[PDB]
């Protein structure tokens, strides 16, 4: 027996179940975004404990694996993909990914050992960054007019979310500012792989 060295046994979902939930394919930049907006208007839990998380790399080709889109043990190449993470206030980190066959929420290190899986032995092009942003800086500064979802004649490759592109007063698009892997870039922190799973795992 191993016991472990407090848990949130009990935690209670920021979000509506993942069926009810917002939510469009090939769009998870605006589905984390409805995730935020939900919790911000919700009142259950400070919007600062929540997090938009980018993951990506400069070549644009991440494996994630347990995804919806590809059923079974291998995974997806994303370009980027967006999770919301929430820093529960005992500590205890929560995953929360439309797009995941694990749980919704999952547990972080669950998350992190099954989706994700280590970059020791992963051809390195093809190692995941993660950008971290607070909830509240990502309603507050994220834009995407979804031009890069269009093909070469300009009409969609996936149907667009079902509201109006997100905008703010200081930008329409600065999509590319978050899934860029530059610390030089855009809001919050830039992670390797280990630097993130040791600043929010157990």
Not at 95 to 115: K, R
Request: net charge negative; glycine share 4%; with cysteine.
């Amino acid at each position: 027996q191993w016991m472990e060295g407090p848990a949130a046994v009990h935690y209670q979902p920021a979000s509506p179940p993942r069926d009810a939930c917002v939510y469009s394919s090939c769009y998870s930049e605006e589905n984390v975004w409805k995730l935020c907006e939900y919790i911000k208007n919700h009142d259950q839990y400070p919007l600062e404990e929540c997090y938009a998380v980018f993951i990506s790399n400069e070549r644009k080709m991440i494996p994630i694996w347990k995804q919806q889109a590809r059923p079974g043990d291998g995974p997806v190449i994303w370009d980027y993909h967006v999770v919301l993470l929430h820093v529960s206030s005992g500590g205890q980190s929560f995953i929360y990914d439309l797009d995941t066959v694990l749980p919704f929420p999952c547990l972080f290190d669950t998350y992190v050992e099954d989706a994700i899986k280590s970059d020791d032995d992963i051809h390195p092009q093809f190692r995941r960054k993660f950008r971290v942003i607070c909830a509240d800086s990502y309603l507050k500064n994220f834009a995407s007019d979804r031009s890069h979802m269009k093909d070469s004649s300009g009409n969609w490759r996936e149907p667009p979310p079902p509201y109006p592109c997100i905008e703010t007063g200081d930008s329409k698009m600065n999509l590319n500012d978050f899934i860029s892997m530059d610390p030089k870039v855009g809001w919050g922190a830039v992670y390797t792989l280990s630097e993130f799973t040791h600043r929010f795992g157990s």
